[PDB]
Design an enzyme around this catalytic site. Structure first.
Site, short mmCIF file in Angstrom:
data_model
loop_
_atom_site.label_atom_id
_atom_site.label_comp_id
_atom_site.label_asym_id
_atom_site.label_seq_id
_atom_site.Cartn_x
_atom_site.Cartn_y
_atom_site.Cartn_z
N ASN A 183 43.83 49.00 48.66
CA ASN A 183 43.40 48.26 48.81
C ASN A 183 42.75 47.51 50.03
O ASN A 183 42.69 46.96 51.16
CB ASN A 183 44.49 46.78 48.68
N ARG A 184 41.52 49.27 50.74
CA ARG A 184 41.10 48.79 51.57
C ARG A 184 41.76 48.58 53.46
O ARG A 184 41.37 49.04 54.79
CB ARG A 184 40.21 47.54 51.96
N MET A 185 43.59 48.48 53.50
CA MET A 185 43.82 48.90 54.69
C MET A 185 44.64 50.17 54.94
O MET A 185 45.10 50.91 54.96
CB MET A 185 45.08 47.89 54.34
#
Lengths: 203, 203
Positions: A183-185
């Site tokens: 989730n790009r984190m």
């Protein structure tokens, strides 16, 4: 999250220091079938501008990461003017990267001999065959180079080290571990002066 | 010679120009199941010292290779001071590499909008959740950053481009194709001023 199959990279993963973790990461990649799991992309500087190419990490310990190359190559010259480098291990299959940056030093004549002697002779020849920065127009010419070198050593079982072939070692001044997440984190831990720092995903 | 199932890369492989060959190689990397076929290690400079990390090549054309990132990252600051980069596609599983070096311009606002919109909702949020400066002490904190940004945009069908977010393009002033060979007599063809040049394996 899925890609390495693991939960979040966090500070506690660094409890036994940066080396143990790198060695573990390098082993997860080997074990998972990654091709050339010990290859890293090395950046040097030429006249103020960055240059990148892949090398093979051959020694990993508290003094840093070492690789082997001709002193006569462009990597060698650039490192002679500006003895600092950065390297990245690109483990895309696992959603992982590690970066190491620091001052570079030459490895010992001692060490050069050892890693030179483990080298399969199919490669020992290959090294010698590379006619350091000699003009080349064809590929046939490359072949002749290896044939000529092959004859010359045909009766030798213990091929010696070329006169300008050794290694370099990047000191672990700054080491960064990068674990990607769907989730790009992304989980980013930087190690510097024994201190640890967590970085925002987008740097 | 094994690893890409192929003969020697040679000047005739360049007949239709570097762009077409880089596109073929990218596509071969895909057909072969390579993870993140379009990812590349990007090196920049920071106060005369190289720095590396991976980015995703999202645009490949005549004007070069382009990737997207926050202008407020270390990489953005480094490119603002010294607008030159080198990048390497590390295709280890096929025994291939491509390097690209050159000056770096920003992409347009036009193209940023176009590629921003192609991101799935998850990735747009992910990007907005990365808070440029703000130090981070815990991982739970990244979570609450994603949860603030999810709730903040719960009613927006179409999420806006973040204020700091854009792209960079490396012009193809030097392009090298590297195809490894079992016998170590690697094939290397450099492209510069439309002139082609074969290089000695050992650089």
């Amino acid at each position: 999250p899925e890609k390495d199959g693991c939960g979040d990279l966090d500070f506690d993963w660094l409890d036994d220091g940066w080396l143990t973790l790198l060695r573990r990461w390098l082993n997860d990649a080997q074990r998972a079938g990654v091709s050339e799991p010990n290859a890293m992309v090395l950046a040097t500087v030429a006249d103020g501008k960055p240059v990148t190419r892949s090398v093979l990490c051959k020694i990993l310990d508290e003094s840093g990461v070492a690789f082997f190359t001709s002193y006569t190559s462009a990597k060698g010259e650039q490192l002679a003017v500006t003895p600092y480098a950065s390297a990245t291990f690109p483990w895309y299959q696992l959603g992982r990267q590690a970066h190491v940056q620091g001052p570079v030093s030459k490895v010992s004549t001692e060490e050069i001999f050892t890693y030179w002697s483990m080298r399969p002779r199919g490669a020992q020849l290959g090294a010698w065959a590379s006619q350091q920065s000699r003009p080349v127009g064809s590929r046939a010419q490359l072949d002749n180079q290896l044939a000529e070198v092959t004859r010359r050593f045909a009766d030798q079982d213990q091929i010696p080290v070329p006169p300008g072939w050794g290694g370099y070692r990047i000191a672990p001044e700054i080491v960064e571990f990068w674990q990607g997440r769907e989730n790009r984190m992304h989980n980013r831990i930087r190690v510097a002066n024994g201190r640890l720092e967590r970085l925002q995903p987008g740097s």
